[PDB]
Amino acid sequence: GERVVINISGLRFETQLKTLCQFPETLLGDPKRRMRYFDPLRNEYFFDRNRPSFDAILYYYQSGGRIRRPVNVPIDIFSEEIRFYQLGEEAMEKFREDEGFLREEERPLPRRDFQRQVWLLFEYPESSGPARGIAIVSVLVILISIVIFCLETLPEFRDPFFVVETLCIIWFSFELLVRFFACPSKATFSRNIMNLIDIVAIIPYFITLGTELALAILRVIRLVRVFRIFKLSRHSKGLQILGQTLKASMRELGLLIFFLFIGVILFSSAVYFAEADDPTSGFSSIPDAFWWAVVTMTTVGYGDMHPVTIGGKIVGSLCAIAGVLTIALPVPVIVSNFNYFYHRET
Amino acid sequence: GERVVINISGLRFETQLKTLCQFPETLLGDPKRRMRYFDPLRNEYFFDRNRPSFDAILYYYQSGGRIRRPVNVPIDIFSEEIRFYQLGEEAMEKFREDEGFLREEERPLPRRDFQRQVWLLFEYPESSGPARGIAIVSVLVILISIVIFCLETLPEFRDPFFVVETLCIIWFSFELLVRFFACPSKATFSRNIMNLIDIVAIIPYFITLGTELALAILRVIRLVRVFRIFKLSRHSKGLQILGQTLKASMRELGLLIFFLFIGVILFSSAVYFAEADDPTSGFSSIPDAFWWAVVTMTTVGYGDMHPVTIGGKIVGSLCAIAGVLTIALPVPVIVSNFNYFYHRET
Amino acid sequence: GERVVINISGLRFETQLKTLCQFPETLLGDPKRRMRYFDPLRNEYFFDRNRPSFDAILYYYQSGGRIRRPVNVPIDIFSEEIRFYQLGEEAMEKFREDEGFLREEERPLPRRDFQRQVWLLFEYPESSGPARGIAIVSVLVILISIVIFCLETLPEFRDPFFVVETLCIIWFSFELLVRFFACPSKATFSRNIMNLIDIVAIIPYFITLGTELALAILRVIRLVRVFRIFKLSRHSKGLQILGQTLKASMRELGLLIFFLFIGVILFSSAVYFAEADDPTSGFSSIPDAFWWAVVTMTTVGYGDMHPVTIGGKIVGSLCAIAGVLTIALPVPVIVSNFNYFYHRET
Amino acid sequence: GERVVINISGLRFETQLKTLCQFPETLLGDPKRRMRYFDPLRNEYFFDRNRPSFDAILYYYQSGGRIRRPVNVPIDIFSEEIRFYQLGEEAMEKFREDEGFLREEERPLPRRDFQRQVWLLFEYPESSGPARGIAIVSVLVILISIVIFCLETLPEFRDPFFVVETLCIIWFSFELLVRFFACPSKATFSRNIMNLIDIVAIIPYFITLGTELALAILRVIRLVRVFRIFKLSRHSKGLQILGQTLKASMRELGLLIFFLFIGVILFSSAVYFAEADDPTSGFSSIPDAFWWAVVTMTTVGYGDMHPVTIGGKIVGSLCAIAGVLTIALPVPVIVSNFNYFYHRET
Ligand SMILES: [K+]
Ligand SMILES: [K+]
Ligand SMILES: [K+]
């Protein structure tokens, strides 16, 4: 039933020896490290230190390791108070996990001299000079492949285009093979999103050459060749934050599309029933005002043609207001996700 | 005039025995449960516990049951401190009512073996496999009734449509009767909004069949058949949150419509008086610029036709600014109501 | 050099007798009211009370009347602690002036039996039944005068209109005379904004009748007859909050108009210089793209006609982005003013 | 091993004499200034003062000069507590640098009687009457030069314009020479942005006169004459805040333009591939839907012409939603920068 008096510069605390011996790897736990500060006469351990920090430290032992920082104590002061009390790296990364920093992982490096040099050359551009050369050459090759895609579909042209496209495909396949064979773990390579993007960027050229030298299919292939824009996400950090934002916000995008569908059916029905007994109106069905309701609710504008009645113009006024209301509701959640993932960098 | 000294790990509190005996059902109220911690020599009750939590607990007795959590104490720590002090379930749900959680109701179940099984089968879809089957069949029947409504009004057609519509009405009436006759309390059934929606979804078919086998009326009936979209609110949780948001925000919607009316009258008057002495302008009245002012203030756009004078274009510039200002003012209150009801789920 | 020990339920405070006698109208100031709580043996004044509240109360005397509420003490608890300490109504309305409530004025009533009855009948509608009758009759007369204004300017008509307009003017002048002759202070009557609005609502009828029974002038008079919409601000509380918002935000409205002017001159110059060597473009001057730049920056839309070059479409893309940026900057300050004046009601 | 007891009105603190002597220029550091408050009997220094402020002051010595204000202490109370403790102007501007006020610089004045008078006359308009006269004359000359620029390019005219333009250039060069020769430090003059703006405002007149009395070049010169709008930034404080905002937000503007480029390429590709097998569609290439995708994503509107298929209208619906999402993401960071630099004035 022995007690112990800990005096943090005038603010006197008291507890049991069991609570101090529950963590016998800290400053106050072992009976010899804390006799550094013991005063024989006053029977107390005088720590000329910080007082709100010590009431948080004393709660950590009582809570059996549950941790929190008081709201009136700054992070650096509390950090070096944890360090002074030598609570433990367990308690330190508990405090980090509690505050919410993502400082937990360090990705490995290949176990050889040759692999380490080519993997750090082709993967980490901040290292060397040749690394920045590979980065700038890669961004330029991606940009000219986009230009070749759009110029292919111009009507003055429809071969130099096949030669430029096959040079771009040679460079893409070359750096994909070099990145694959120089990686540390091949089990991780078929889980990165960017390596899947590079594979889908080089596939349709090879299947076109195969079936060409051996309706919906060829339209799918000509629209799947547009996924070479997403090869810029390796060199752009705002695009990676945009992908993280869009993955964290999938319920809000579904709600946006669902609310717009409900409003389009409702206001198309209303404007068609308001303009049926008028032979000079343009709405001939309810599936004919769908596009008018979409461009009125989003505020793009349908052009000169307008409802022609009085009830149709009252319905159009309500459609223009209701779209602003409908769209403005799930969008602050998506911009909060963006602000979170974006300022997480600092 | 006896005092009592309560020592929360060094932080010494003092009060009267009357204040402790005012709640004689707690830990400190009865004279035998709190002699667990009484120290005979120091004449104090040593609780090796949390200090800001205890100043809140000591205030609860003094305030005669008024409760609050200090701003520097987290909710779980204060919750188990209330639990340790055994303040009472009265004090615990007072603390819950103070913080503002809606954890108060549990809706009943029918008092029989048969009724409980069919009511939980047709009302709670998360229970069983047949429950999810009934849910998916119901959503599919609602969707094909919407498709039948719009395809009915196409002009290439205007019978398979009557057969599909009467099958949909048979399913709606069947599940309405099964939900009605299997419910616990029939006094609650004519107060849910969704049961009223189901009744209005099946009424106009039956009154059309009745008066057909026995202007504004038939137009009202053909526009009241569109309320089958709101039968999706039973299966969608975002739509229920949208209804709660729109009911909590009825003053702000009235202010939005009132501000837009004031602006439409004002800017229509101004643009007509700016373009009266010009024979090539299109505004022939003040009730002819109402629609131009609506689409300019909302930013939809009126199309190619524009004011034709210099004063008319100065008035149009001010209309385009004033609509943004007018609309942007009552909308943050509606999106705060949405964020409240939406994150209330977690 | 006498000290005094004040013991707030265990938390011991200490000060000088000079600091307590500096306010000798309070509980601790006079030497007989505070001997209610003095303990002769322990030489202290035991107040079984609230501890953070007492450190704020002890600071009030030291600061010579400067007051503040601690951030960890709620408003009702601190209010009744001020009341318990009987600091003074001076200190109580200092605390109210510090927190920022507008509970300071009570507007007078006429000093007679007859004047008090007609002034409360015609000014305060929440009193009686005839008061609500006068309110509803007034709103209906204002609404039919607005309808008469717009129907006057229709072209099928251009007398019942003169009879309806002269009945509306008789009612406006009647209630203006009754409100003027029944008011308590006639010095305040020519400072309310609403009485000036009523005078401007009845003036142009009388000057038209005078000069008619005795270009810019008559156009000014026909546009000054539109100020009868603002007679609804007496019966509407959202419109009064809108007027307070617009008066508090006059620097931000000037910045909005100035930023839009800078952008219109800049992008009109750029699009004209990008499309000068092309005979099929529509911009013939820099003062001919002013209206295109206004409707592109505000997002209303100019219609089918578009820049016709490549440099003109690059300039148009930048105009569409820059308007969103320019407009979005001074608008959160205006909506914060609105939220302040609007939630000030509760 | 001597200790010292400091009693802040009942709240007793304790520390070592080394910690107090570490700053021997303050109130508690020198052994004679603090014997003002020493009580010989109780062996303590009684400061009838503020208690949370003193725990912050005691931490300052322990942290070796690191400073912070507690979150529960207001700024004026803590300021005069620092002043009472005479911590030092070093500690006072450390506290100011910690809170984040920009009260650090005072710009010099010329070292002569004549230079000081003309520099304060032509640079500081708030001083005198002639200073405000120079300010109003300068703003009027800038405004008529803008009017001359636009009226020059009207087609009814294309000499009074050369005379008005040469008078404006004489005034600009005159005040530039007077401001240059009367300044204190000529090393600072070629680093202000506004003096560079004045030089670029007077250059192209002189090079036109030189090469005229001695394609892309003359188009560059006729578009560089538009930089006379930015001479209003000396007389306008909202424009200076806009320039500070736009310089602090250069990463967010690049992200806005990059996200819009990605979306334009994506939705142009999709709408062209959705409308290729239809001879009545208007999209003939992917570089022909670029402008439609820009005006649909920004909500300006493309006019009457619309996608003509069903897949094209589904793609157009997604384009109209995706632009709102894309644009709304980096814009709250720019408006937070604006609010910061704008309310920094108060
Ligand atoms: K538009
Ligand atoms: K728009
Ligand atoms: K349009």
If you write DSSP's letter for every residue of C2-60 in order, what string do you get? -EEEEEETTEEEEEEHHHHHTSTTSTTTSTTTGGGSEETTTTEEE--S-HHHHHHHHHH
My answer on whether A124 and A216 are in the same domain is yes
Partner residue opposite B150 with nearest CB, options A12, A286, A302: A286
Q: How far is CA B117 from the centre of its chain?
A: 30
Structure tokens at B80: 């188990």
Nearest to C319 by CA among D298, B306, D336, D327: D298
- Distance (Å, rounded) from C-alpha D209 to C-alpha D221? 12
Nearest chain C Cα to B331, which residue?
C335
- Distance (Å, rounded) from C-alpha D148 to C-alpha D140? 12
Asked, for residue B244, whether it belongs to a domain, the answer is no
Strand C44-46, strand C38-39: pairing: antiparallel
Segment 101-120 of chain B within 8 Å of chain A by CB: none
B332 Cα to the center of ligand 1, angstroms: 22
Q: Flag whether residue C40 sits within 8 Å of chain A, measured between CB atoms.
A: no
Asked, for residue B47, whether it belongs to a domain, the answer is yes
Asked, for residue A304, whether it belongs to a domain, the answer is yes
Partner-chain contact C328 D335, CB within 8 Å: yes
Spatial strand order in the sheet of C38-39? C11-16, C3-8, C44-46, C38-39
| CB neighbour class for A89 (10 Å; exposed up to 12, middle 13-18, buried from 19) | exposed
My answer on whether D228 and D257 are in the same domain is no
Structure tokens at A284: 């001939």
Task: Provide φ and ψ at A170, rounded to 5°.
Answer: -60, -45
- From D178, D211, D235, give the residue that closes a domain: D235
Q: Flag whether residue A305 sits within 8 Å of chain D, measured between CB atoms.
A: yes
My answer on whether B256 and B331 are in the same domain is yes
Mutate to test the interface with B, among C7, C9, C145, C337 (most CBs of B within 10 A): C9
**How many angstroms separate the Cα of B207 from the Cα of each of B144, B196, B214, B317, C313?**
22, 17, 10, 52, 58
Structure tokens at C341: 């004046």
Asked, for residue B16, whether it belongs to a domain, the answer is yes
Count the Cβ atoms, other than its own, within 10 Å of residue C80: 12
**Residue A220 in 3-state DSSP?**
helix
The number of folded domains in chain A is: 3
Q: Which residues of C touch A301 (CB under 8 A)?
A: 301
My answer on whether B206 and B152 are in the same domain is yes
Asked, for residue C241, whether it belongs to a domain, the answer is no
C227 Cα to the center of ligand 2, angstroms: 30
- From B187, B211, B235, give the residue that closes a domain: B235
- Distance (Å, rounded) from C-alpha D165 to C-alpha D168? 5
Nearest to D91 by CA among D160, D8, D28, D180: D28
My answer on whether C60 and C88 are in the same domain is yes
Ligand of minimum distance to the alpha carbon of C304: 3
Nearest chain C Cα to A296, which residue?
C300
My answer on whether C120 and C212 are in the same domain is yes
D74 Cα to the center of ligand 2, angstroms: 45
Strand C3-8, strand C11-16: pairing: antiparallel
Q: Flag whether residue C346 sits within 8 Å of chain B, measured between CB atoms.
A: no
- Distance (Å, rounded) from C-alpha A82 to C-alpha A103? 18
State how far residue A299 is from chain B, nearest Cα, in angstroms.
4
My answer on whether A222 and A127 are in the same domain is yes
My answer on whether B211 and B126 are in the same domain is yes
The CATH code of the domain that includes A73 is 3.30.710.10
Nearest chain B Cα to A69, which residue?
B72
Q: Which residues of B touch D301 (CB under 8 A)?
A: 301
Q: Residue A322: which residues within 8 A CB-CB, separation 6 or more? A: A263, A267, A297
Nearest to C318 by CA among D320, A298, D261: D261
Spatial strand order in the sheet of B11-16? B11-16, B3-8, B44-46, B38-39
Q: Which residues of D touch C270 (CB under 8 A)?
A: 223, 226
Q: D16 forms bridges with which residues in the sheet?
A: D3
- Distance (Å, rounded) from C-alpha A14 to C-alpha A62? 12
Mutate to test the interface with C, among D77, D151, D153 (most CBs of C within 10 A): D153
- Distance (Å, rounded) from C-alpha A209 to C-alpha A203? 10
My answer on whether D132 and D214 are in the same domain is yes
Write out the residue range of the structural domain in which residue C69 sits.
3-99
Phi-psi region of C65 (alpha: psi -120 to 50; beta: other; left: phi over 0): left
Whether residue B279 contacts residue B228, with contact meaning beta carbons closer than 8 Å, is answered with no
Q: B16 forms bridges with which residues in the sheet?
A: B3
Asked, for residue A285, whether it belongs to a domain, the answer is yes
Nearest to A81 by CA among A103, A104, A48: A48
State how far residue C48 is from chain D, nearest Cα, in angstroms.
17
Q: Flag whether residue B301 sits within 8 Å of chain D, measured between CB atoms.
A: yes
Q: Which residues of C touch B59 (CB under 8 A)?
A: 50
Asked, for residue D21, whether it belongs to a domain, the answer is yes
B263 Cα to the center of ligand 3, angstroms: 21
Q: Which residues of A touch C70 (CB under 8 A)?
A: none
My answer on whether B312 and B335 are in the same domain is yes
B271 Cα to the center of ligand 2, angstroms: 21
Count the helices and strands in chain A (H runs, E runs). 14, 4
My answer on whether D222 and D256 are in the same domain is no
Ligand of minimum distance to the alpha carbon of C302: 3
**How many angstroms separate the Cα of B260 from the Cα of each of A116, B253, B263, D98?**
67, 11, 5, 47
Q: Flag whether residue B17 sits within 8 Å of chain C, measured between CB atoms.
A: no
Q: Flag whether residue D277 sits within 8 Å of chain B, measured between CB atoms.
A: no
- Distance (Å, rounded) from C-alpha B238 to C-alpha A259? 9
- From A210, A235, A260, give the residue that closes a domain: A235
My answer on whether A215 and A255 are in the same domain is no
Q: Which residues of B touch D302 (CB under 8 A)?
A: none
A263 Cα to the center of ligand 1, angstroms: 19
Site of tokens 């599940």: B175
**Residue C190 in 3-state DSSP?**
coil
- Distance (Å, rounded) from C-alpha D258 to C-alpha A241? 13
Partner residue opposite B306 with nearest CB, options C74, C146, C291: C291
State how far residue D340 is from chain A, nearest Cα, in angstroms.
17
Whether residue D294 contacts residue A300, with contact meaning beta carbons closer than 8 Å, is answered with no
Tell me what percent of chain B is helix, strand and coil, each rounded to the nearest 5: 60, 5, 35
Nearest to C256 by CA among D22, D338, A268: D338
Asked, for residue B17, whether it belongs to a domain, the answer is yes
Partner-chain contact C299 A303, CB within 8 Å: no
Whether residue A325 contacts residue A265, with contact meaning beta carbons closer than 8 Å, is answered with no
